[PDB]
Amino acid sequence: NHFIIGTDMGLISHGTRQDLRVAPKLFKPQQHGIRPVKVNVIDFSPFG
Amino acid sequence: KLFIFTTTQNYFGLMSELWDQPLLCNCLEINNFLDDGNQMLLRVQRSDAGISFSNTIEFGDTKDKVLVFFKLRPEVITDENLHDNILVSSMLESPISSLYQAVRQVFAPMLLKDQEWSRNFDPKLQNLLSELEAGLGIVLRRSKERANYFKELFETIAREFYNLDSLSLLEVVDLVETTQDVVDDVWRQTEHDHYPESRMLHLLDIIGGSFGRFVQKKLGTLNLWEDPYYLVKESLKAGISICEQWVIVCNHLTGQVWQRYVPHPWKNEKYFPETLDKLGKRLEEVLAIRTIHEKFLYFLPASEEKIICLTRVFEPFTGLNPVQYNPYTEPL
Amino acid sequence: KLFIFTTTQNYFGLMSELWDQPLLCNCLEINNFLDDGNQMLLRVQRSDAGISFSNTIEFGDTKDKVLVFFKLRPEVITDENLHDNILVSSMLESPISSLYQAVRQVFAPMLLKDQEWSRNFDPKLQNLLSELEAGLGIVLRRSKERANYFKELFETIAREFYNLDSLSLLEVVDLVETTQDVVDDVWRQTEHDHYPESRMLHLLDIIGGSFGRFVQKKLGTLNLWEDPYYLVKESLKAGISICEQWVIVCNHLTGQVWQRYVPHPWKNEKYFPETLDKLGKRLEEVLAIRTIHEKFLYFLPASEEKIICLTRVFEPFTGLNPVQYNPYTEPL
């Protein structure tokens, strides 16, 4: 039910399906400005 | 650490300056009062040759004298004197005397004299204070063959009743009917035209209020938030029936009992404050909410997102009307 | 003749016993207080190099501190200690505000806590106190589409503002961003040309103060010195993030909206005390100290003998790292 979505603007958002207010935060490195790095591959570590 | 101790000595003990020896465990509560922007109060009490400060206020004492500090500003300004940002007020640890003296001596004459011409609600607040202190003052100042029969008869009934917490909700739903009947019967013209009004109403008021406290406790032990709602619904409905049934029979039967069996001065009038009525409605609202939710649950594939999310959204809402509820902050 | 003067000194003036020289014109009103069974009150106020005693209660002054003496007994018993039959209560120069806080803080919890579950007639006292504090609160706090717009935008975020205790550090960060956007919209003058500059500035001050106190409230409870450095720095940095972001955003965005949403004479000005900024510095200091110790442990083989001796001395230092960092006392 949880998922993340990346955009060309250099940010990745978090969300889910059932409860849409659990943690509506975004992911960002320790950077400033924008840095539209145009994220193109997302994966998940297959572990606990 | 200057004003706090100085005032403590001035009120409790020797009217002088305490030695600069802040070597007590109570110094932490003092430091919290000063520095913590949330701690707007600090209680002090004189112990056995000792001083005890605590942010927590407790009223277990019987008739002791305490003093409470009250802060004006969010945080203490240490550079300024510790008496230019703090108020003090003494009070007795007596649920009757303290309110009586405090209201009568301080608040009633203060509002009467110290009133701004442009502020409203003053005459209402004045009336409230007057009625309040009056009631407290009243409490603060507080053939034997027939007398023995009455005592023995009603004492037996009262003691049989007093073992109420030992009964479940599913049983007291029927007790309300039996108790109302038997109590109204014994009041009848048996050995005397009419027993003095004192117990005539007092016993019924105790019995009615006792059902209130009974249901309030028993519904709390249902955990009206947990998963086993099946059993809760059964016991909850019983709690409502107890509350409503007693009120209905009281209001109906009183009209005829005081005309047919006991020549009581009151006729075609009721006595019971009907506090059970509000308690019953409280449970009815809970039942309706839980029932509606269960109905939505049957349609869980239709409103999955709403049902799951709203459950936890509504939990802090329900927390505004806890178990053992008393409607003294009902607007919340 | 001891308690009245000594208490006045302890609260208004020097924290000491006044010499036994009752040679003031105000001694008559004091003597009346003591001997007259009718004068149950005596107000004292410190004037310009003067002390004025009078039963009369006044609110001509704006924000001064006064104290009123109250007796329990009609007349003073001179044989008994002169501080065991007299109570005091201080107040600010507000006939409404003093009553509101005094009643709410003292009486409301007194009756509710100090009550036997089986005692009657208290429900009346409860209702009286409820109406009493309500009317005091109501007065103290005192086309339409304009006001309605403002209220809708306020309430969107005021629900949490007034209930922050139920949130956590991560939610607070979200709240900081959320709140700024919501209040920014309030500067819009498209629903109605009127925009209450003074209301927005006042509200922002109130939010800043309360919010800031909240943040440090939550941070204080972490006890940021424990062995699990991982959890210490994680929660610690969250507090810093809240502090920095809130200060930066509020100051920058406020300075903008003053000229963008409303073409006001104000722009690019600071409107916040930045209490969180001081908190953030304190948090950074705790992190630096806690971290540099951990760094020593990471490289422990370099100076192991020193870390052992340094740990033993580090502990009594850490004991001096309190919470609620009041800048007045931080030198410790």
UniProtKB/Swiss-Prot annotation, chain A:
Tissue: Expressed in chondrocytes (at protein level).
Cystine connections: none
Domain of life: Eukaryota
Localization terms from the record: Cell projection, Cilium; Cytoplasm, Cytoskeleton, Microtubule organizing center, Centrosome
Quaternary structure, from the entry: Intermediate chain of the cytoplasmic dynein complex 2, a multisubunit complex, composed at least of eleven different proteins. The cytoplasmic dynein 2 complex consists of two catalytic heavy chains (HCs) and a number of non-catalytic subunits presented by intermediate chains (ICs), light intermediate chains (LICs) and light chains (LCs).
Disease: Short-rib thoracic dysplasia 8 with or without polydactyly: A form of short-rib thoracic dysplasia, a group of autosomal recessive ciliopathies that are characterized by a constricted thoracic cage, short ribs, shortened tubular bones, and a 'trident' appearance of the acetabular roof. Polydactyly is variably present. Non-skeletal involvement can include cleft lip/palate as well as anomalies of major organs such as the brain, eye, heart, kidneys, liver, pancreas, intestines, and genitalia.
Family: Belongs to the dynein light intermediate chain family.
Job description of the protein: Acts as one of several non-catalytic accessory components of the cytoplasmic dynein 2 complex (dynein-2 complex), a motor protein complex that drives the movement of cargos along microtubules within cilia and flagella in concert with the intraflagellar transport (IFT) system. DYNC2I1 plays a major role in retrograde ciliary protein trafficking in cilia and flagella. Also requires to maintain a functional transition zone.
Protein's name in the database: Cytoplasmic dynein 2 intermediate chain 1
Source species: Homo sapiens
Gene field: DYNC2I1
